[PDB]
């Protein structure tokens, strides 16, 4: 879990139970492929981490610039980028890491 950082930046993430959206900082690493997320300063312990090998990442039509990751074991993460370019860049990086 300590490798080179492939991409980082903030995204809004939906919580599972109450469905609110919160800004978190995300960091994608390889070997193994994982997406960790943090408090938006990136200063504290990670909040969580998503194992990406074999995941499905999909752009979701409209909340704007939505996309979803479903891990290989069927855990869903619903995310929103601040711009269409950032959704396109995150999907391409997760799809390449997921191989
Ligand atoms: O750990 P805290 O209390 O800050 O909670 C997160 C969300 O809980 P709430 O934001 O209090 O509703 C949470 O959403 P819901 O099920 O929407 O209540 C979300 O599932 C949970 O996600 P992870 O633990 O990362 O899976 C908590 O959100 P994060 O702080 O982004 O971790």
Residue numbers in the entry: 241 to 302, 311 to 347
Please quote the authors directly.
To investigate further the nature of the myo-inositol polyphosphate interaction with C-PH, crystals were prepared using recombinant C-PH and IP6, which permitted the determination of a high-resolution crystal structure. To our surprise, we found that the complex formed contained D-myo-inositol 1,2,3,5,6-pentakisphosphate [Ins(1,2,3,5,6)P5], rather than IP6. The resulting crystals were of exceptional quality and diffracted to 1.35 Å. The final model was well ordered with the exception of an approximately eight-residue loop region between the fifth and sixth beta strands, corresponding to residues 303–310. Ins(1,2,3,5,6)P5 was bound to C-PH in the β1–β2 loop region (residues 253–264 and 277), making numerous interactions through all but one of its phosphate groups. The only phosphate group that does not interact with any residues of C-PH is that in the 1-position of myo-inositol. The 2-phosphate is the only phosphate that adopts an axial position. This configuration is strongly stabilized through interactions with the side chains of R264 and K253. The 5-phosphate of Ins(1,2,3,5,6)P5 interacts with main chain atoms of H256, R257 and N260 (water-mediated), as well as the side chain of R257. Regardless of its source, Ins(1,2,3,5,6)P5 binds specifically in the phosphoinositide binding cleft of C-PH making numerous interactions with residues known to be involved in binding PtdIns(3,4)P2.
